[PDB]
Design a binder for this molecule. Structure first.
Ligand SMILES: *[C@@]12=NC3=[C]C([C])=C([C])[C]=C3N([C][C]([O])[C]([O])[C]([O])[C]OP([O])([O])=O)C1=NC(=O)[N]C2=O
Length: 108
């Protein structure tokens, strides 16, 4: 299954991306210069379901894992459907350190 993988830093208050796989750049059209240090929400646009966005926002705050279907947009403006699964990574003290995401393009 063709998938992409990113890492967000949860020690910073707005979860900026700190590592992205070669496919994530190829799929979205953005280079690392425009991805690292930013929140993943730049991928969103008009037809992105705000209720679906809210489930990811809630789970991050509550430190749970979450799986949603989102409409995303490449850098060239064209849309694609992104099955996104975010997973919390905890330190031994139960605190969340990083969030990890698997993104699958499900436009079939
Ligand atoms: C994005 N992938 C992605 C990967 C990780 C590890 C995390 C933590 C989040 C994402 N997002 C969501 C984005 O960062 C943000 O959490 C949401 O927009 C909801 O929060 P807000 O405050 O903005 O409502 C991903 N979002 C995407 O659209 N595409 C992904 O690949």
């Amino acid at each position: 299954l063709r998938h992409t993988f990113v890492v967000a830093d949860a020690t910073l208050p707005d979860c900026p991306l700190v590592y992205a796989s070669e496919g994530f750049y190829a799929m979205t059209g953005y280079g690392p210069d425009e991805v690292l240090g930013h929140n993943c929400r730049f991928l969103q646009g008009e037809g992105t379901d705000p209720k679906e966005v809210q489930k990811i926002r809630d789970a991050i705050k509550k430190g749970e894992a979450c799986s949603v279907r989102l409409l995303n947009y490449r850098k060239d403006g064209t849309p694609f459907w992104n099955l996104l699964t975010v997973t919390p990574i905890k330190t031994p003290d139960g605190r969340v350190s990083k969030f990890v995401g698997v993104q699958v393009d499900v436009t079939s």
